[PDB]
């Protein structure tokens, strides 16, 4: 369900700023602000109020010490420990251009050379945010350094400036839940006579100001055993009744999303606690421990195995590993939803359908044949 | 439409050459050509005429100075500044093997260590091309270095050679245009009673020798505010009548490509100038400025907002930023195309269809009922 989300510009809030430093008379404003002061708040010609730093002061060494010497036709450096010291200072400036020469200007994630950890904590501490957002990013520096972009701004008027674009978290501490879907499929000895479907609305769900967000990409989200650290650029909002779909599939308030095919494969899904093993056809599905071998053998159909005592789930030839978190799992002993539908008439080919849409197709085809 | 393009070997013109340096009696020809000459033109045994260089001459130091000393059982180096010079010279060779130890032989993009910027300009200047391709390549080094492959070729006969594969741009200065699509849907209070379709032919379009190319992947193409720097390896050609589809959707000369579904989401598309905001259902779609807040509130249906005075487009909970280029936008006041079709009978499930194909399905289904 990745095509339904809107496409947006990745970093358009940094290129807009970098286009402002280019106009005449602007770079001199920044230089005057950083007069005998490393960090100072400046106001651009755009109208925003950016925060500026003065990392890697290099004029105080070359211009003061090494410049009067090498311009005298009989230069003579005294000792070798001056050369070694100068090589270390110049080393950081070389790494910046090397990393900028292959990315064509835009860098992600920002490396340690670019915005060092000893300064990123000083850049966060003066952001215009609350006292809880700062604590979130202060203890999670390795994550906010993975969602940041740095851009070539200007090298004009004998100064190098590159804009660092840092993320800002607006919504904190709302419950995110995530659901994993498996293709439940009917079992018959004769192949080709089995119909079945699977839900497609898998991903991360959580509230956002009276609504619910939904990220269909299961790989563009982080985990710190309590947080998700995702982004809203690739999310589509939904009405707050989606939670009723999980418990009441046949409710009329909000129809769920399903897809249908007449094929089945014994495929597993590794959840946060255990695996939703689903073996069909003629395969050997097994869950085993690491100290006692085989401890369980599933039958045909959907099945669930917890991670308390199970360390390896094998299906066919593959050998999946199971996560080892700690939480209370539970089982809702219901009945499969597939047995309602008649395998004779069925919309076998669907890619983006719903409970109602599939119901209408069956209702139309079954009623049409009832004429005569 | 990513699956409709053909699949080809990424770097098959370099492995072919690397397989030629291996046969006996060949690497001696290269060594003889580079006798007291860095850059020279050599002809291989394959009939091709490659251009070779002799970067990082290291035998002149170790074999001449450090070799007679360390084989005497009583070695004694004079001063420490000799060691420091040797460490700098030996540093480049270490970095090359480090880059090959994780990529298993093929490296992309070529790093500064492999082919430095001071040399890539000299390598371009002697390529057998015209005087305009050289100018394009010489002023865009950071792009032609991002589309170049390097292959570990041979280390036999006490000499190390790795082939560097550079792009060669053939078609220059033809106008490339790009179209953005949004899922326009009809608006009804009762959910499930609204259909819609959306065009899938989004990507880059521009001419190639009397025809038109088409890159469906919107991410594998660059931008320098005037150029695209795309590649024809993952593009499918089309007849030159595609441009008539934009202005005449219902033309019979060439049918367009659409996809159909009975679901609607409020998703935006960030274009080169403004955003195609399309809010449906019950959501608050808004375009706001950075100095005055809310300045516009859209209604249900497709809408367009320019980037002149608008610096932020918000749909639902997300907050998309808008690019800030400078161009003359335009608005063609037409009428929505979905109002023609009857929502009663409609092929709601499509993934790769056309205007004619959907027309045929309605034409057959509507006429079949009209029997009696």
């Amino acid at each position, epitope marked *: 369900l990745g095509f339904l989300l809107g496409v947006g510009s990745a970093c358009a809030s940094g290129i807009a700023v970098s286009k402002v430093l280019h*106009l005449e*008379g602007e770079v001199n404003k920044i230089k005057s602000a950083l007069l005998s002061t490393n960090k100072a708040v400046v106001s651009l*010609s*755009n*109208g925003v109020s950016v925060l500026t730093i003065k990392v890697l002061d290099l004029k105080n060494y070359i211009d003061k010490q090494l410049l009067p010497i090498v311009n005298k036709q009989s230069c003579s450096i005294s000792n070798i420990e001056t050369v070694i010291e100068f090589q270390q200072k110049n080393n950081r400036l070389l790494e910046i251009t090397r990393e900028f020469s292959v990315n064509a200007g835009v860098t992600t994630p920002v490396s340690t050379y670019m915005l060092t950890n000893s300064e990123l904590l000083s850049l966060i501490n003066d952001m215009p945010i609350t006292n809880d957002q700062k604590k979130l990013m202060s203890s999670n520096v390795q994550i906010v350094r993975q969602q940041s972009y740095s851009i070539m701004s200007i090298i004009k008027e004998e100064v190098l400036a590159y804009v660092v674009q840092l993320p800002l978290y607006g919504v904190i501490d709302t419950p995110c839940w995530k659901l994993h879907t498996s293709p439940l499929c009917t079992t018959n000895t004769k192949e080709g006579s089995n119909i079945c479907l699977t839900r497609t609305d898998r991903g991360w769900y959580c509230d956002n100001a009276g609504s619910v967000s939904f990220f269909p990409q299961a790989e563009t989200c982080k985990v710190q055993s309590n947080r998700v650290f995702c982004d809203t650029m690739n999310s589509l909002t939904l009405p707050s009744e989606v939670n009723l779909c999980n418990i009441d599939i046949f409710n009329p308030k909000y129809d769920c999303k399903i897809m249908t095919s007449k094929t089945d494969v014994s495929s597993s899904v590794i959840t946060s606690l255990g695996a939703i093993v689903s073996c069909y056809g003629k395969t050997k599905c097994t869950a085993s421990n690491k100290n006692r071998g085989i401890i369980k053998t599933f039958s045909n159909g959907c099945d669930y195995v917890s991670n308390k005592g199970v360390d390896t789930v094998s299906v066919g030839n593959t050998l999946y590993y199971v996560n080892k978190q700690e939480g209370k799992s539970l089982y809702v002993k219901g009945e499969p939803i597939i047995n309602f539908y008649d395998p004779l008439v069925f919309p076998s080919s669907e890619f983006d359908a719903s409970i109602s849409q599939v119901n209408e197709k069956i209702n139309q085809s079954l009623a049409f044949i009832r004429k005569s | 439409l990513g699956f409709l393009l053909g699949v080809g070997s990424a770097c098959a013109s370099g492995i072919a050459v690397s397989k030629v340096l291996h046969l006996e009696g060949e690497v001696n020809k290269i060594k003889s050509a580079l006798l007291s000459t860095n850059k020279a033109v050599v002809s291989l045994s394959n009939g091709v005429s490659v251009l070779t260089i002799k970067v990082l001459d290291l035998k002149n130091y170790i074999d001449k100075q450090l070799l007679p000393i360390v084989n005497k059982q009583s070695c004694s180096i004079s001063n420490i500044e000799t060691v420091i010079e040797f460490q700098q010279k030996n540093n480049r060779l270490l970095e090359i093997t480090r880059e090959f130890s994780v990529n298993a032989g093929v490296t992309t993009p070529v790093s500064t260590y492999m082919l430095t910027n001071s040399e890539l300009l000299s390598l371009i200047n002697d390529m057998p091309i015209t005087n305009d391709q050289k100018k394009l390549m010489s002023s865009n080094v950071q792009i032609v270095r991002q589309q170049s492959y390097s292959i570990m070729s041979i280390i036999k006969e006490e000499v190390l050679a790795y082939v560097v594969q550079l792009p060669l741009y053939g078609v220059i200065d033809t106008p490339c245009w790009k179209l953005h699509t949004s899922p326009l849907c009809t608006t009804n209070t009762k959910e499930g009673s609204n259909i819609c379709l959306t065009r899938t032919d989004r990507g880059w379009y521009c001419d190639n020798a009397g025809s038109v190319s088409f890159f469906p992947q919107a991410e594998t193409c660059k931008v320098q505010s005037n150029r695209v720097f795309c590649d024809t390896m993952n593009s499918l050609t089309l007849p030159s009548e595609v441009n008539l589809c934009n202005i005449d959707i219902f033309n019979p000369k060439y049918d367009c490509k659409i996809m159909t579904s009975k679901t609607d989401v409020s998703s935006s598309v960030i274009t080169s100038l403004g955003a195609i905001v399309s809010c449906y259902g019950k959501t608050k779609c808004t375009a706001s*400025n950075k100095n005055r807040g809310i300045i516009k509130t859209f209604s249900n249906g497709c809408d367009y907002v320019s980037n002149k*005075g608008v610096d932020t487009v918000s749909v639902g909970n997300t907050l998309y930023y808008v690019n*800030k280029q*400078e161009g003359k936008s335009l608005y063609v006041k037409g009428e929505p195309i979905i109002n023609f079709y009857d929502p009663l009978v409609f092929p709601s499930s499509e993934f790769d269809a056309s205007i004619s194909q959907v027309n045929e399905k309605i034409n057959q289904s509507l006429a079949f009922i009209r029997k009696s």
Partner: nanobody
Amino acid sequence: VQLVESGGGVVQPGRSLRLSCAASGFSFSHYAMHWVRQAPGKGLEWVAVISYDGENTYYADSVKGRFSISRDNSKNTVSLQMNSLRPEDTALYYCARDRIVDDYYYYGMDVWGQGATVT
């Protein structure tokens, strides 16, 4: 940084007058231009404003229809055109710049200059 304008003199009511205002220093092709006139000892009042690119113009409601303002980016100059001047236009004009860049909304003035006098 400064900008200079010309066009002084006295003309009988009924004669047109086109006064220019050159600009140097700041990038002229990214800013809007304002015209404001002040009678000697009286208060400032607002006159037409031309946008930075050149398709949007807004004249004062009191004096509209007989005013014309033009902007050129190649010579980075702005020209104001008037016709049928009346005796209460004897004042000191001011060709002043804005303080925001590349916006279609206008926010006050930032840079002024030695204006010209009419009649």
